[model samples]
Target: SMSYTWTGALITPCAAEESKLPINPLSNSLLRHHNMVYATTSRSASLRQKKVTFDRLQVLDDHYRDVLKEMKAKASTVKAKLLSIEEACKLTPPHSAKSKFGYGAKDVRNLSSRAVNHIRSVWEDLLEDTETPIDTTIMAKSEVFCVQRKPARLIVFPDLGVRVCEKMALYDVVSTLPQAVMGSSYGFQYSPKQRVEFLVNTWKSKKCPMGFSYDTRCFDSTVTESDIRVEESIYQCCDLAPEARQAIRSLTERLYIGGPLTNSKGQNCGYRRCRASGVLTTSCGNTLTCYLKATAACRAAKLQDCTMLVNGDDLVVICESAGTQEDAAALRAFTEAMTRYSAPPGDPPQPEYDLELITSCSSNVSVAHDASGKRVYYLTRDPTTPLARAAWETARHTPINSWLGNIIMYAPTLWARMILMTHFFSILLAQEQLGKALDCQIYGACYSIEPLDLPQIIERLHGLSAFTLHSYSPGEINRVASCLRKLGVPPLRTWRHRARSVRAKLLSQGGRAAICGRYLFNWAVRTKLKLTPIPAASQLDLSGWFVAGYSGGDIYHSLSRAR
Candidate 1:
């Protein structure tokens, strides 16, 4: 079946959209290549539609069914609870879109009578009307990027009331089921530090390890009605409340299986027969489906002792190598198996003997030396997108600041510590906004983080070594240098000089700001300060920071800790 069926209606935007980063007073301070930075807009949705709307063929084999049975066996051990309407509303992000029924995110969060009444009506409606397709808004995601000029990613989401209902019915299942079913292969359970440790240990555990990351072209589009039904069967294996089961069944039949796509102007743009991009199950469902197919594909390819690390649709496998020629043939076989399963690769998989050469989740493991001259491993990627985004953030005040998220997730990288911290803090310090709280996502959950607490946050998450890491690998250094050149970001030397000024201003403030100066900006000085354990690091409540991935799951900080 085709992933999407369209009418003559257009995907129109209600407001004006900007495609290029506007030149601003502070833009040149962070990145000089303003022309290179661009954002995707509604105009490109038609192009994305052409790319994603295709027929898919999935022929499941005994191996796939075998894995599915095993997955069900594991899933049966889970006990999932149904969240109350209030609980679900609490998980909604503050800026979530308003429901067509007249209530907004704030109204829902505050438990306003009007919002609660509407939500109750929607829930009852879901239980009674299981056959009618739910309505979803189709919008183009305005993500900032470099010169690649890729078409805008289309996001399909139901109204706010249905979104809340999804959280109420499946929040517990999505949060708890993936870890229990996949165990160590569940990528969301590991923090950045833990992820590197797992990858390194997995690489060493293999004898002549050969690794590759499988990139499924349009993974969400590849999802079929059978795939959605299969996922629901797995969820049904869990111990769930009767109402929860009913809600899940109804939602699956009406919404998840397929839905009508409406533009912002209320015109019917198309119909989607694939996975909805903005739902609670998007992350969990993708992870399960991708893992299931890849695991079965591994058997068909005769890959040995394969260990997979899956985060949603991002997959990287480390398996015992069968020499170069044999491994190459095995990868080709793997691709063929995945293609048959409707997950054809965007680029053909290549077997790599070196673990660091294989990238997944847009990150790779790289080596650097600590202040003690001991070897340290950290995760990093090209800084082109991060720097370009930082420049955009510098010029405008956007919700969900990626620079803060990048700093939190990539703290151990040289570019993050040297360039990202220096540039952002310089701007924040000048504006006297260092104490202001900003929003960022970690593993897809939104968090309200104060910039002043970064020193403690970094210490707790990445450890004190993150501040002192030096003597980076030549490969990492060259990657960062090249990205800086390409993005027209200031060179490390310029950032270092600028950092000293920011450091002085911060230190003169004499509090958490001073702690930030001494710790995060230590690289700026010729003689680095001796780093030590942050006294407040252990006191911060970071219980759920790395427990799960909630991409498109409507999860926020208040709900994260309740897990």
Candidate 2:
């Protein structure tokens, strides 16, 4: 009864690969902005401005081009490696061709290096442009207050290559364009053609205004000694069961699937649908099939019961009934034991008690270690709980949902919804803190615009703290201050001290131009950019081609040849 009352679930052993995952590109947007802001502000005005300017236009273009080149180079390298592997496999003694080619040590290492190198090059060039000044002002003069900052130039890559690097290059190119075009038109509207050309020229110029070295450490003025408490709490919450930890890790890993369906006439069918179904079959097998069948039967039977089938073989069967009352009692006991075992060792004061409980159950049910030392798990439920029933009812009411149910039931949408929710909450928390610290009315606008305010806020906060408010252009500083207060984050008492310290650091280091330049860059480009905050509006449109690129690239790079 208690197990039934506990609606929370844990989803866990997270796959080995999932546990050692790289950071998600989307989630890094905020962290990247933070790093860029600090790096831009802390450096010499000349260097900072130069970097931003270059990054905004020229450097970004160069980086885009460089990525294209790197993609080609890396692809060539991988192709060569593949060839080598093939040749090696043909050797007199064919040594573990299976190990040599598919997700083997050699393949992963090679592909990872290529991807890492390609990304690293982009950042390196962004931070170290020689022609541009490091410090440029990012805020506009009061006279030019209404003018928006120019958008960062984005390079659109055409889908032209079979290689992962080539595809990655294309992705980078395409991914960069919309934001750049949207960003460039901050205070003005442009025709589609004009937007395209603007982006092209910006790409060609290879000059961007947002530049900072990768190694630069820009400390957050807002992160104080007290922040350690929050960080510690996070660390404590992170100490979960290995299985639960694995589940979280797996959930966070990026998965892209695409292909054509044999029966397009089926409800809710598309290319990705077939591919996703295939993945479910391979990863989840009979359990997935049974789950789908049971769900359909439950709908037909109008049953209110829930059951879980767990045998020693690491397979779990979830159904609406467990056959008998004795079985039901055993299931309840098992659920209770699992729940207790999964809970973190902590007292009532811990903030993560409820979260731990839910996460543990989900992890326990969804994760298990397979024979090859891989972790596999599946999720299925009886629509007995309120949330579960609501989700089911909602799915039943919509054609798309019904069709999707016929395919993989609730898995895909559930996973998508959970991920999106987590990221949304993370952003909200960050924005809240930023708003309070900067005395600004920080809201989640469009991606292009959200980061626009950073330069001005940093400048104003710097001016207020540095006592050189009179030395800088007065009107610009005043407007920046006004914007800060309007955003609801009034400058703090520590503002003056921080500003003075930064100013002293800049002057002493001969980087005043870099600092000033960074300010100008942000003002000229980021502040005026039009940004859309709506998730639906800003959501990425992944097409079949996109999925194909991701799949091919991911798989190719992951597998090695016999050599």
Candidate 3:
């Protein structure tokens, strides 16, 4: 009878991956579907064309103006720093698109003069020119998703050179401004630790909490060009350098609003139908616009004691539950307000008791074995992409492993530890890349990483206290089980079995691999391994990539040490 009862709808897994080469030589020896590789190659491939619409209008009333101005003020205060070529190169993933200028990210990171020269020239050209828009390569990205099959999302991103330029110009602004404006509502910046804390606070603050996960039908595709323009208005409020202002404007017009879309078949895939996925601005834009619209909509609906947690397009609402009939009328008012502001909910807003009962960011609160083997309550999602990407990473080098990112983000989760970390570190250890530093984009920016540093990284990102977190509501467990069923992935028990095998082999190794083994699979063991800092991690200048600070929002740059 609960809302979580029916997200349990099963989407049958597509069985097409009959791999040519072994996905992973070692893991293949163990599990049947170990290191499953998924790609969008068939006719129902990931790419699909959609209509471009600017039909929805953004209302710039007093509240809208006030919220936006606050975000702009935060942007103005955020100090932007230009990253060195090496830093930029390190941030670039190994499997990213190679440069058109006869240089790859390897060349850029390795300080190949030609690569640096080309990139520097691109950066300089951007700084000097005001009117010229930087050209972005538009392509439909083939991605793996857990539920059924997902379409390749359209992404418009500049070259490696201009990406570095973006980091310099607007990265800090994107990083900090939304938090300054929206406070706890800013989703990208919060760790799983803070998110749970926020939820607990909101849930008890009201009685019979009514909540819903607002699904924007194709959230990106639904965004109008006008939304991008209004976002541009917010950015303009910042005290940017004259050069920075012109570049941001030029980019806003050329790439952000609408850009070229190309497909693998050498056909022009028509212009962009919505917000481009692979830009520096997309997340921040969504956060800004979603916050503004939802906040205003809540006010319009006159919902009782409403508090919001908007994580980009994935929004959840908590308020005093009105009666069924009254709530329906309230939702009607909410929908009416939203339709006026251009962000119509994909599903009619529904009421639920627990906030976690409403899934956001495709992640819901789920129970998993922590270090203590206790049923830990943390966030998790279907491992479709991570498992698929892990397999792909097994086949070849990827820029960052989504699997690893998930493990870190949802580290306390049973699946992340048992499946994701075990799979990735297993491959890396065999390939002798345990010490090799790679970067995974967490929250919104890139983070330097390696297998050995995960204990420290996890401790630092999510507090050590997370290991004991537990006892999810029945609704939450039901939601997670449904996710497992839908994605056709193994359950936490299966993950636990795999992790035990993984832990045994890791300990069998008599060297640093043993160290990696113990640290990563610590959840499997009784006595938890003490988190020791890696010296190389200290040497890493994670300046632009990670900012540490106050928990409430407006975070200051964290120059923190391992606990």
Candidate 4:
């Protein structure tokens, strides 16, 4: 048995100069109170120990006494405060005007002004460093950014607020712009054309190569012909750098059909559809092909539906929709079949395992196939089954060493595909009982050995007789057989040894002793759990040594004998 104790301390704040107060007033008060209360309580305990037997009481009683003593001392101190003061000092204003005019006002204002100025400067610097301004009106007026008037090649506008021109390759714009201007405007406008050239030259100075042709062959024929060949240069300008080329390639492979595409100026009319498809669409649109491929891959994997049954043990049922109910029924049927087979030779008729439906829902179940490709379904028992009985007697009064007891004790591992399969549920039950016991014990309630007693809740579970039978079926029996076949003799023996060792250790120490000796108790617990010997040499040395008084002659005689 292990126990936990919590101590509560009531702290009181001490008087201090206002200037010495912490930055957060509430936190400061809390800290002050905590320190003062703990100090006062400790002092009180030291003084009280001289007059009373404090060791016989619980720690909580000690805490209470200490707190009360501190409170009484505080009250006495308050009562001893003098009411009289100097007449002039008493007449003075609580707040001083001169004090307000000094460091307080100046320091606050100066600090606030400095913080505001710093923030403003940071914002201005960030804007200057990261942004570039462009005139949208000038861009709209330019023919170079558009497509040809006749047999049009699609021209896609950059998303608003993005500085695309700055990132564009000089050569790419030079090749496409000049052609678009020649075909549509018949000549370049000086102002607009100059602006474009300036942008190109700036990018060139950064060592970026520009000119590239994108054609209509990059798009599927099924897509509309409004497509235009979007140049790689434009992509670079949009900050779609080479690092992202792998992702772009994947998108292009799935979405783009490369062949031929018309230019924005419609110079290459045959490839117009291909050019428009790639140029006008965002990269995300190309992801549609990836989605289709994913669906096909899922189908190829041969995924199936499955369900998990939660009763006493987790039972996973794997089958198609039509077979789900049947599989569940078969499991219930198998439990009944096992009960009948495991019956004592001359024992009176006992009710076979009956299936009680707790819950039902749809789930995706998968069936495992062996090397020979034969299907296998695994069934497991629910740990909650024992505790689910309406009456505690039904659960606790069952005979130990009975067939049912053996089954209940081994079912968790034997009927389940894996160990620790029912660990969570068992822990849940253990914790629930332990928590209640601790609460009652801490509050000074009577402890009992009955099942209704909090401590006994966990104690009762040690024996296999604690479990009660419910529904059983033939299908469940078959599943149990499958699990038994999978469970070999060696592993079962190992498990039994471990369980017995754990039980022995827990019972020997008792909860109170374990809790009192918590820190070094773990080694003892481990030894007990493993059924290892507790060596006497390993016991902690805590005893003090003493010598009896002796006469000088006796001491001399003793010393001579030792020599």
- Give each prediction's root-mean-square deviation over alpha carbons: 1.6, 28.7, 7.8, 39.5
TM-score to native of every candidate shown = 0.98, 0.18, 0.77, 0.16
Name the better of 2 and 3 by lDDT. 3
What stretches of model 3 exceed 4 Å from their correct place? 1-37, 42-47, 51-96, 107-134, 261-269, 367-376, 383-385, 395-397, 424-433, 465-505, 508-563
Q: Model-by-model lDDT, in order?
A: 0.91, 0.23, 0.61, 0.22
Name the runs in model 1 displaced over 4 angstroms.
559-563
Candidate 3 root-mean-square deviation in Å:
7.8
lDDT of 4 at 28: 27
Best by lDDT: 1
1 against 4, candidate with superior lDDT:
1
lDDT per residue, candidate 4, 428-475, as tens digits? 234443222111110011111111121122112221111111223454
Candidate 1, 385-479: lDDT as tens digits: 89888888888888889999999999999999898898889888988999998999999999999899999999888888899898999999998
lDDT of 2 by residue, 55-100 (tens): 1000112322332332233222221011222222121111111121
Worst 10 residues of 4 by lDDT: 551-560
Considering every candidate listed, which one attains the maximal TM-score?
1
Summarize candidate 3's per-residue lDDT along 353-411 as a digit string, tens digits.
66556777777665544446665456766555556555555555555566666777887
| Backbone clash count for every predicted candidate, in the order shown | 0, 102, 5, 54
